[PDB]
């Protein structure tokens, strides 16, 4: 009689199809998905420090648009800019806007220190009905609109040394009046000049007079510039008109901070990986949710599914 001894292996009734080098569809006992394809639709507020911009762009929070006063001196790991955001102060532009936005985002702080420039011979604190703060005509909080005093605008030549151990970021601008009359009414002379310099840089700007389309009834514009002043260096502002002066400096830091455009709500939860769609889990090595990511994130790929076999070939009877 004797015996029979058979060697064999398991199988399952519910196998999974995977791809290999030689076969686009082969059934195995089990697999695991390597492409994360969903978000929870909210940005978790831990572990990254999230600052919700609400109605404010980062640049408006920097300059000090009145609706952004709550952002003064705030810090973030990730600043979230919303598509509903709008400007509601004096009309302005920023040559190389994207660069100023990037460098502030990456710095992660709006910490601002006031400095006394001792502006002498000019009127300070110019305001506009385009920039309403507490029902009164106002202006960007961090900027100082200088105009004539007694129909004289005497040449400004002002120094501010950096005696600190850190870099200072100065934000300033040039006012472009809508007409030649407005140039006189504000600066009591026909041609402004601004030169802002350090030992290692110089920026010279000429206003360009002319009508731009009216925003909150203003055909004029301000153009925003920035200057970084290193320790041991000196800021030198030399101007005969059209200066929108700084009130102080921002701390500029280095670290892990950034900015992201998203309409996802902020949630009370923990997730290392943030996308504009919301936080996503980061167990899987890849994801197809969004190319835009912040934190410890799976790598973006253009595959909806990649199944890794975790078992042998499934061979049912």
């Amino acid at each position: 009689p004797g015996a029979t001894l058979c060697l064999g292996h398991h199988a399952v009734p519910n196998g999974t199809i995977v791809k290999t080098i030689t076969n686009d569809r082969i059934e195995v006992t089990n697999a695991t998905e390597l492409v994360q394809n969903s978000s929870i639709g909210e940005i978790c507020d831990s572990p990254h420090q999230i600052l919700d911009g609400e109605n404010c762009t980062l640049i408006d929070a920097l300059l000090g648009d009145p609706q952004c006063d709550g952002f003064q001196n705030k810090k973030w790991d990730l600043f979230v800019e919303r598509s509903k955001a709008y400007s509601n102060c004096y009309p302005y532009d920023v040559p190389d806007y994207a660069s100023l936005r990037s460098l502030v985002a990456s710095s992660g702080t709006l910490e601002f220190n006031n400095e006394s420039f001792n502006w002498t011979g000019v009127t300070q604190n110019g305001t506009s009905s385009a920039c309403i703060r507490r029902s009164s005509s106002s202006f960007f909080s961090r900027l100082n609109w200088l105009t004539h005093l007694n129909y004289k605008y005497p040449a400004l030549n002002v120094t501010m040394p950096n005696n600190e151990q850190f870099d200072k970021l100065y934000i300033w601008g040039v006012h472009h009046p809508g007409t030649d009359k407005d140039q006189i009414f504000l600066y009591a002379q026909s041609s402004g000049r601004i030169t802002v310099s350090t030992k290692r840089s110089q920026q010279a700007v000429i206003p360009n007079i002319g009508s731009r389309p009216k925003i909150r009834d203003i055909p004029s514009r301000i153009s925003i510039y920035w200057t970084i002043v290193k320790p041991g260096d000196i800021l030198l502002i030399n101007s005969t008109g059209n200066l929108i002066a700084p009130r102080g400096y921002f701390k500029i830091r280095s670290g892990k901070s950034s900015i992201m455009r998203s309409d996802a709500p902020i949630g009370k939860c923990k997730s290392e990986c943030i996308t504009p769609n919301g936080s996503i889990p980061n167990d899987k090595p890849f994801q197809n949710v969004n190319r835009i990511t912040y934190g410890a994130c799976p790598r973006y790929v253009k595959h909806s599914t990649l199944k890794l076999a975790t078992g042998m070939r499934n061979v049912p009877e």
Copy 2:
């Protein structure tokens, strides 16, 4: 007596050498080449819509150099620029030429809609012997050279609303006269100013007077600028001299269009993949013909040959 039964495999008299992980040269029964190394030397005119630039750059076709009048309102998937191309109109430059070329190429259309600006107080339609159209002094078709009327150039302040559902691309410029006399002869005053703006952008230009080397006897130059006007926005042109005005706007589209520099002839044939050398077949995954490609193309690699084994090791007797 019994029998012998031998197991074995085929071989061929004409084997092919391939590379593996362990051997740089090993003979197999057959292989296939994975690097496409040739073109047919012509750009096939299907399935992509090809527009042969002939003597015209895309920028000259845009501005309306007289030799390019046949390109008015044409559309393309791929615009082909030839090395024989030359300019034959008023001498000009384009600050960020490469960007204007790119954005027009990518748009894929020179569709142009005329608009009436109602220029009042100035002479329109200035011409030059540097730009001959039908044996007569002429000018860029899409540009309007404004000069004084009765030795007055009254300030221009003109609006053009965008009430359409699409974006408008405006092309305009500034004339830089060769001398201070020419400035007077043309604009009847010493200092032109141009400000072109929308609600969301501003461009201010000052002419720079001086002699450039003479091209078709002209020591002056035009510098070309562009402005995109979104729906609900307004173009505002404010100028006291030196304006080379737009005659209307170009449609700006998004899609799959591009531009390529090539001297290859156009052929009547079908090929998905275009290179400057000519169309190439796209069966193989890689190619060493050209890094520059358009369409469904093999990936460029720096290998002249990569043979994929399609058979076993060849072991002749």
Copy 3:
């Protein structure tokens, strides 16, 4: 009785741990390191031609700062810039400094040919106590500071044809005086204009008057520009003041030359691969010494060690 015949394999007492696809730590008989992790701490002077900048940046050697006179007409495969380098001539800046540095570095030569411009009506060879050469007030060797002659600065309109078979690189500048008085004292009129052009390019610059912080007692600044003139083209310089003129042109070549920032000493030895840390051997395919490399170099990776098995699994008794 009979016999026993045992098949087997070697083992070693000192095996090495490697990683595989299925096991992060498995012992093999031998391995080799694929990541080069050290430099010899000196830049070997063969086979690449090395030029040690010493106290000079490449840009200072180009302009002709007095401490850099030893670099006139020198050539390099790799220019080495040291962190101790400092400028000691007239204070200047270069709009797009990084681009001028790159294009000169890549060219590999400071070969300079003098040309006679025949400046008539102006004083040549202006000097400054900010730029001392042999205990005397001097200036950048390759630049010519033109000022008034007999309180007239007659308009300059000068040509220089390129009748050579190669491209010419012209370096020139604009002087920005510290005050309106200095503008008069130097150029005998209130508003300088510079226009430098060829048949295919134009650069127009306006000086910007104003105080910058004093460097070697100078509140003024020069801004440096460049112009490439092709064979058959012509340089045209047209100016009414504030021109810092070229004395000739640099040869601009193409080849394998570059520039590197390093404090490593130069050594008498041979090594194909240079990093800022020093030369490294290039037997291994990868390295973690520095992302910055020049020559035949292993590829930079973020791994400290990658051991390639060169023997079987080690299975001691």
